[PDB]
Design a protein around this nucleic acid. Structure first.
Ligand SMILES: Nc1nc2c(ncn2[C@@H]2O[C@H](COP(=O)(O)O)[C@@H](O)[C@H]2O)c(=O)[nH]1
Ligand SMILES: [Mg+2]
Ligand SMILES: [Mg+2]
Ligand SMILES: [Mg+2]
Ligand SMILES: [Mg+2]
Ligand SMILES: [Mg+2]
Ligand SMILES: [Mg+2]
Ligand SMILES: [Mg+2]
Ligand SMILES: [Mg+2]
Ligand SMILES: [Mg+2]
Ligand SMILES: [Mg+2]
Ligand SMILES: [Mg+2]
Ligand SMILES: [Mg+2]
Ligand SMILES: [Mg+2]
Ligand SMILES: [Mg+2]
Ligand SMILES: [Mg+2]
Ligand SMILES: [Mg+2]
Ligand SMILES: [Mg+2]
Ligand SMILES: [Mg+2]
Ligand SMILES: [Mg+2]
Ligand SMILES: [Mg+2]
Ligand SMILES: [Mg+2]
Ligand SMILES: [Mg+2]
Ligand SMILES: [Mg+2]
Ligand SMILES: [Mg+2]
Ligand SMILES: [Mg+2]
Ligand SMILES: [Mg+2]
Ligand SMILES: [Mg+2]
Ligand SMILES: [Mg+2]
Lengths: 110, 21, 95, 100, 38, 354, 52, 118
RNA sequence: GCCUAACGAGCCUGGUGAUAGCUGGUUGUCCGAGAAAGAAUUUUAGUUCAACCUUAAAAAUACCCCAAAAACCCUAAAUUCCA
RNA sequence: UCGGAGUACAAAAAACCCUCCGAGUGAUUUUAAUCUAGACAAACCAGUCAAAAUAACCAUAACAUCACUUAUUGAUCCAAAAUUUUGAUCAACGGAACAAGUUACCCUAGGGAUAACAGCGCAAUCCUGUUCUAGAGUUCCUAUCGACAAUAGGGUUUACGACCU
């Protein structure tokens, strides 16, 4: 007819790990098409806007302030156009590390 | 989320409006 | 697959599986990624690495290949300077 | 133009009484597809207070709102999610003002 | 299978009919008729 | 479904209507300042600090120290304004400022800083390094009096010990000189404590040099309870903290339980708890000076371990946790050939019966 | 505007080729690529045309 | 779509008259629930079937004793349209180890410890 | 059209137990558990996987799941994750 | 065949010969490597990310960038390459290496899983009555009609469905 190509499978864009989930390094916390959840502490950002934990720990979700990069012209312009009392807020995903860095073990008593 | 009390904390499009007689 | 041959009455094997597959003595099967030699200029470096990397087969394909291959290919093999001799066996399988 | 129940269609004013406007508006209300009446501010207020009084002095302890909100008898299996807001007064496009 | 909104009054499921009959309005009836009560 | 916010929303104060009459900030720096100002407030929602350890938020710190110097604020402000006006009246200083050729007497700046606001900076850095977290566990003090500690490397080489400095055991082998201003009517106690280096007890610390009943500034004439011991950190676990604590006392304190022998080479006797020490001497002693420094392992530690302490040198190493691996599957799907190498016991071919 | 597929080899003497999409109306292709055989920043020049 | 039903907390806010209507103590709540299954789980959702299964109410018209804790009260609220719930009454106290074989549960909701004395 | 009562290409024998995703049938008793469809396919009259399910064997967590948490102009019934 | 929006309102998935946008590529230089934890997605094949470590440039980044950036693409085998690559509107796009019409001269195995006739469901269409009065009727809505509209009934025509054969 006139409407063609409307069939396309879903890309499973969603949130994988919720708050309190114990994850390891490299686990993909969430995937998205547009910036819905921003990475925070110990969460990387893949080139397809996916979020993966960098350290092993507990996943948390926090509402925080948004201070954009000065090089991002669109965000900078939005910031300057914001009124005097307005502060941008976003939802960030964090990983609280549970495993210590290491332990000082005795090797040899020389 | 919508059912959470913190819904609409990121609402910013109402703070900037950028789309005589 | 010929379950009963005409000359000897034995069970034959398909040559495609032995040509494009490798069976380890642990029961696993080895195979290459599909499309690792087609249009390398159009693909990303990570995608090319994934194509070049070897992969395994799951239970269903392993059982299919075992059915389609005779027990001669399931024997223990001691080749000289065999790269896969270290992978022939399985260790620390808590099942 | 979609019209719901309880929405005004034509609103009139002036220095006239209610009898004549009701008299020549009842024909329009009847010829309208949905049931309609020629009401005024006083008539609308009177009906709303009458409905409030009826639903407040209802004698039987069992009401559609109570049962639907409490999931008595597992009735939400038969009911619709919009019945929690309709409170049994609206069924499809039909509205019965006598059903509390 | 009919739509949610129809013109034929959408004859209702029996348990909903019973629910409506149970929840029908009951007006308050006084003990003595006040017309020619004192 | 909608829920009511548990408190005031962030941007609910400003009016949405008539935005053109509301002033804006056009500076990314202004927005950054506002954002960092707001980020420090105790919001009712789950913030970053709560999950990443703001250290129990507010803490009512017990103050154990001397009262602050009572200074006449009005006269101090008048003198400061007069000094500023006299400095402003000069024309040569203005010329230097315009021509961008101006210098500052850093020695006088440091002296004035120590005199007026050095104690607060020292206290906050000692917070940051966790001195009070391990010495009193609940109490912070203001180092009101200065404390200049200096080690002598030779005839003309002097290494200062500032708050957080790094001094090697080669420099710290000999007893240091301590200077502080005090009249000839008070008594002081100096205590050098090693916070890290106790092999057995984690909740205990070492003593290196404890001298008590110091008349005024003269530290040598005061009786030394514990003789000086050069620092001995472990080779692996480095950067231990050594703190000189100076206490002012009123009465002539004598103690027979904390007395240490002249050799004092027994680590069993060289085990200390500043909490219990201040509990014992809480009536008279009050901490007024503090100077802590970092110390790592060098070649001189072996001599201390062998000749003095009569022990073998312990060697440590920062070992890392083993990498995490999932449960090995019977039939891994689409996994690389190296999947079997992640669970290999050793890189040695094992022939079972052959 | 049709593109061209060109196979370019290393100028470091070692045999190392890679394919690149180019515009037909451009000059001969010459770039600075990375050679893993010599592990160096190597000038690569056009020699062959594979696909249109 | 037909899904599970959220019951607002206003339903479980007892009125002052409810106590003397249902014979309950307004100030001490009771301790144990006697729960009986009246209706069938047929023509009922699978989650309700699972709740009935985990409450130990497979056989209808057979009472089961449960605690009065919110953990089980949640499931009781979920399947409250299929069960009759009474407070366990102990006119003669808890049965000791010597009265375990001589106990009975009268249909009025009480547990008698001395039943059929000789 | 006709070629021995059926000719858009005779009849017999052999290949031949032709081949049929198509139709029909499939023979004693009792007991246990027990399934209505996601993806490909000259494929939707069928096959091959996945999800279910059956007979055995290893283990340990499995359903219900309070908080807390899951987006930005408005958005209901309610969903996911866990004590 | 592939992607975006609603249907599919809030984790994921979700169809129609459902309503709309597109894609089968262009431009530029920063020409964008090797190896390997751990994960997303998925029947399978495929697609996706990616911590640490190594080679070359600041001795501080390298995910090539932009066009709604999401789609801009194709599996074996085989041919040409010569050390390392490429080759298909295989567009019926999980692709047979290459095969058109007509049969009312037709045949066979099946299907009421699927049409033409009948039956049946609905009443778009058709036919009836009543409600509403502006208007025609020389004045006058209803002697005879009655536009724009309302309610209800019948199952005669065609259409729709594909439930019995
Ligand atoms: N062009 C091309 N032909 C192929 C391929 N694979 C098989 N073929 C077959 O190889 C033959 C090539 O003959 P051509 O069409 O060049 O005269 C055709 O039968 C074609 O179908 C392929 O990958 N590319
Ligand atoms: Mg879609
Ligand atoms: Mg689809
Ligand atoms: Mg009407
Ligand atoms: Mg329906
Ligand atoms: Mg002042
Ligand atoms: Mg014949
Ligand atoms: Mg046959
Ligand atoms: Mg078929
Ligand atoms: Mg059975
Ligand atoms: Mg059945
Ligand atoms: Mg919850
Ligand atoms: Mg759980
Ligand atoms: Mg998965
Ligand atoms: Mg790296
Ligand atoms: Mg096809
Ligand atoms: Mg196909
Ligand atoms: Mg596909
Ligand atoms: Mg003819
Ligand atoms: Mg036939
Ligand atoms: Mg049919
Ligand atoms: Mg069918
Ligand atoms: Mg027809
Ligand atoms: Mg018909
Ligand atoms: Mg019939
Ligand atoms: Mg019809
Ligand atoms: Mg009809
Ligand atoms: Mg007229
Ligand atoms: Mg059908």
């Amino acid at each position: 007819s006139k409407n063609l190509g409307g069939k396309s499978p879903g890309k499973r864009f969603g949130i994988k790990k919720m708050e309190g989930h114990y994850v390891h390094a490299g686990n993909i916390l969430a995937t998205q098409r547009h910036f819905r959840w921003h990475p925070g502490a110990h969460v990387g950002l893949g080139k397809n806007k996916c979020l993966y934990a960098l350290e092993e720990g507990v996943v948390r979700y926090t509402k925080e302030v948004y201070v954009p990069n000065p090089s991002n012209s669109e965000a900078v312009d939005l910031v300057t156009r914001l009124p005097q009392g307005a502060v941008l807020y976003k939802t960030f995903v964090h990983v609280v590390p549970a495993k210590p860095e290491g332990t000082f073990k005795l090797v040899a008593m020389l | 989320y919508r059912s959470k009390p913190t819904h609409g904390i990121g609402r910013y499009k109402h703070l900037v409006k950028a789309q005589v007689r | 697959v010929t379950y009963f041959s005409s000359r000897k009455g034995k069970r034959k094997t398909v040559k495609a599986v032995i040509y494009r597959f490798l069976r380890l003595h642990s029961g696993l099967w080895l195979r290459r990624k599909a499309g690792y030699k087609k249009k390398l200029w159009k693909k990303t470096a990570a995608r090319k690495r994934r194509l070049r990397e070897f992969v395994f087969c799951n239970k269903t394909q392993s059982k299919l290949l075992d059915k389609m291959t005779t027990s001669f290919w399931k024997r223990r093999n001691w080749y000289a300077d065999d790269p896969y001799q270290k992978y022939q066996d399985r260790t620390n399988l808590k099942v | 133009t979609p019209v719901k129940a309880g929405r005004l269609i034509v609103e009139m004013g002036g220095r006239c009484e209610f009898k004549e406007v009701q008299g020549f508006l009842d024909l329009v209300a009847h010829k309208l597809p949905f049931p309609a009446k020629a009401v005024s501010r006083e008539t609308l207020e009177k009906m709303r207070k009458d409905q409030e009084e009826r639903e407040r002095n209802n004698q039987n302890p069992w009401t559609f709102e109570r049962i639907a909100t409490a999931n008595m008898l597992g009735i939400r299996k038969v009911l619709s999610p919009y019945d929690l807001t309709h409170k049994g007064r609206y069924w499809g496009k039909f509205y019965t003002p006598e059903r509390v | 299978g009919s739509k949610a909104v129809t013109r034929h009054r959408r004859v209702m499921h029996f348990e909903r009919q019973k629910l409506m009959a149970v929840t029908e309005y009951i007006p308050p009836k006084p003990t003595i008729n006040p017309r020619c009560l004192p | 479904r909608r829920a009511a916010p548990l408190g005031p929303m962030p941007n609910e104060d400003i009016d949405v209507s008539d935005l053109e009459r509301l002033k804006k900030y056009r500076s990314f720096d202004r927005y950054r300042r506002r954002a960092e100002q707001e980020a420090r407030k105790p919001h009712w929602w789950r913030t970053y600090r709560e999950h990443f350890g703001e250290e129990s938020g507010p803490k009512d710190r017990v103050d154990i120290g001397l009262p602050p110097p009572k200074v006449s604020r009005t006269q101090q402000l008048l003198e400061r304004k007069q000094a500023l006006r006299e400095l402003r009246a000069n024309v040569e200083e203005e010329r230097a400022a315009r021509l961008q050729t101006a210098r500052i007497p850093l020695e006088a700046v440091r002296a004035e800083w120590e005199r007026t606001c050095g104690p607060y900076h020292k206290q906050r850095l000692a917070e940051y390094c966790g001195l009070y977290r391990d010495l009193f566990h609940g109490a912070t003090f203001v180092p009101r009096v200065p404390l200049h500690v200096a080690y002598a490397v030779g005839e003309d080489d002097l290494m200062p010990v500032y708050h957080g400095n790094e001094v090697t055991p080669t420099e710290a082998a000999q007893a240091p000189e301590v200077t502080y201003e005090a009249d000839e009517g008070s008594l002081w106690t100096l205590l050098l404590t090693n916070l890290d280096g106790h092999l057995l007890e984690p909740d205990a610390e070492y003593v290196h040099w404890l001298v008590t009943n110091i008349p005024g500034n003269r530290v040598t004439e005061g009786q030394e309870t514990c003789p000086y011991l050069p620092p001995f950190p472990a080779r692996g676990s480095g950067f231990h903290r050594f703190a000189f604590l100076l206490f002012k006392q009123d009465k002539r304190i004598d103690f027979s339980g904390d007395t240490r022998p002249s050799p004092c080479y027994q680590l069993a006797q060289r085990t200390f708890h500043t909490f219990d020490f201040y509990k014992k001497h809480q009536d008279a002693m009050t901490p007024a000076g503090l100077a802590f420094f970092q110390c790592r392992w060098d070649d001189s530690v072996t001599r201390v371990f062998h000749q003095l302490l009569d022990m073998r040198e312990p060697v440590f190493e920062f070992v890392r946790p083993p990498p995490y691996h999932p449960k090995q599957k019977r039939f891994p799907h689409r996994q690389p050939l190296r999947y079997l190498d992640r669970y290999r016991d050793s890189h040695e071919p094992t022939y079972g019966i052959y | 505007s049709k593109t061209i597929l060109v196979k370019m080899m290393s100028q470091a003497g070692t045999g190392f080729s890679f394919n690149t999409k180019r515009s037909r109306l451009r000059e001969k292709l010459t770039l600075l690529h990375y050679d893993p055989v010599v592990k160096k920043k190597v000038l690569f020049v056009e020699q062959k045309k594979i696909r249109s | 779509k037909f899904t599970r039903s959220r019951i607002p907390d206003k339903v479980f806010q007892p009125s002052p008259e409810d106590h003397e209507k249902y014979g309950g103590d307004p100030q001490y709540p009771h301790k144990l629930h006697i729960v009986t299954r009246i209706k069938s789980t047929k023509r009922r959702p699978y989650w309700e079937k699972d709740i009935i299964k985990m409450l130990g109410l497979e056989k209808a018209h057979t009472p089961q004793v449960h605690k009065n804790i919110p953990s089980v009260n949640a499931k009781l609220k979920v399947v409250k349209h299929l069960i009759r719930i009474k407070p366990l009454k102990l006119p003669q106290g808890l049965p000791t180890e010597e009265d375990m074989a001589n106990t009975c549960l009268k249909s009025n909701g009480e547990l008698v410890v001395r039943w059929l004395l000789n």
